[PDB]
């Protein structure tokens, strides 16, 4: 077995220079983001295109809530920022749609927003793209945004069920074998193709899971350099940060960034 402590020592020894990180809703929660299960026929219709076309207001209700500059990153986001600032982050894969990774200062070239973003939008009819700012007043005002070209509904570039994952997602193909550490925060990775992505790291590479529970591919197909640190995600991260000797660095980073937010 490796312990958390062992992983921590690899990182401080800057021996892990190519950390691939996978994240999900377990890191949104601490920023206040409501869980997406809580009028719709069943909650998943919120990300279903046929239903959206029939009635887009529910979705746009949620877009209003999550639109940029409402929510702020939490200290788990900032830990990932710190990894990046140290030159240790190969890529960060997010299933979340709150865009808090980019607000935390991680550059877009280091990020894969696997479920899309509110940063931009697309006309559902003529496919004209829009910067997200261009539909913000409508969204903020509870009016369904319409295309100036064709009058079609303008949809934020959130990936809906059945729609292709973004282009950038295919960086996984080589990011995962290229990693010298896999970090999994706040997600199980039970859903394909994320599940299969955990298997794509090389045999010798540690996989460190920080999450409420042990779930998905790390439980079904365990490896001997897996480490699972189970509990509140934030507190698991606070523990790794201490084992790294980065506690004061984290404080100072968060203060500097909070000063800016």
């Amino acid at each position: 077995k490796l312990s958390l402590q062992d992983v921590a020592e690899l990182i401080r020894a800057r021996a892990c220079q190519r950390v691939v990180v996978m994240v999900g809703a377990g890191i949104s929660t601490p920023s206040g983001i409501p869980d997406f299960r809580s009028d719709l026929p069943y909650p998943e219709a919120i990300f279903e295109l046929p239903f959206f076309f029939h009635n887009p207001k529910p979705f746009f209700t949620l877009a209003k809530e999550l639109y940029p500059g409402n929510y702020k990153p939490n200290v788990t986001h900032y830990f990932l920022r710190l990894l990046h600032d140290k030159g240790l982050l190969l890529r960060l894969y997010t299933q979340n749609i709150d865009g808090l990774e980019r607000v935390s200062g991680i550059p877009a070239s280091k990020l894969v927003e696997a479920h899309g973003t509110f940063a931009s939008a697309t006309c559902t009819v003529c496919q004209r793209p829009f910067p997200g700012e261009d539909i913000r007043a409508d969204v903020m005002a509870d009016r369904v945004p319409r295309c100036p070209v064709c009058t079609g509904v303008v949809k934020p570039d959130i990936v809906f069920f059945g729609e292709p994952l973004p282009q950038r997602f295919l960086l996984h193909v080589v990011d995962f074998p290229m990693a010298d550490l896999l970090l999994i925060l706040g997600t199980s990775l039970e859903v394909e193709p994320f599940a299969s992505l955990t298997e794509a790291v090389r045999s010798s590479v540690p996989r460190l899971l920080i999450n409420r529970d042990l779930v998905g591919p790390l439980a079904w197909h365990p490896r001997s350099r897996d480490v699972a640190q189970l509990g509140d995600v934030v507190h698991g991260v606070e523990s790794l940060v201490e084992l790294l000797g980065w506690t004061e660095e984290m404080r100072d980073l968060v203060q500097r960034e909070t000063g800016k937010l």
Partner: peptide
């Protein structure tokens, strides 16, 4: 396609 799931 993004996979149908619950939530």
């Amino acid at each position: 396609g993004k996979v149908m799931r619950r939530l």
